[PDB]
Amino acid sequence: MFKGIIAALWDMDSIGEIEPDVVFLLKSDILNLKFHLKILKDRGKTVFVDMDFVNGLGEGEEAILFVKKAGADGIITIKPKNYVVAKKNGIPAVLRFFALDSKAVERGIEQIETLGVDVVEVLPGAVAPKVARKIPGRTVIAAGLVETEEEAREILKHVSAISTSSRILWKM
């Protein structure tokens, strides 16, 4: 499911063609999320919603169930509690991982192992391969500051996928 380029969307006004099968909707709002999801689901996409950036939405079980009701296939979040609750309710979830320095990576890996995280999004993308080598068996999606085709090709040798809003990368 998570393989190659994943389409990241920051807004829903001007969209155009979305080649990737998987979409990460990275911003929305509570009033309009269902309409945004209908557009994307109608295009035949699998859609994960970054619940932390749905304006008006809070955290926790009721928020996660709202995003499911709105039509999401899964959630993305940086909050371990949202991740555990999603999992407990049988909702696909991706945990974000900010790979900033060695200690952040050590702590993140401890958290991944303790909570049983199968799918992790590592930012920025350049350090995703390094992190992926430390968590063999887990799916890593790279994201952030992947700025050329050459960077993307190289990252994809080591991680499953890259999330990006670059229409050029969507075509590669």
Please spell the DSSP secondary structure of 143-159, one letter per residue: ES---SHHHHHHHTTTS
DSSP, res 116: T
CB 77 within 8 A of CB 85: no
All structural domains of the chain with their residue ranges: 2-171
Q: How far apart are CA 39 and CA 171, in angstroms?
A: 21
- As its CATH architecture, domain 2-171 has Alpha-Beta Barrel (3.20)
d(CA 126, CA 104): 15
> Experimentally, how was this structure solved?
X-ray
Q: What is the DSSP letter of 71?
A: T
DSSP state of 92: -
- Cα torsion 145, 148, 153, 154: sign: negative
What's the CA gap between 168 and 157, in Å, rounded? Answer: 19
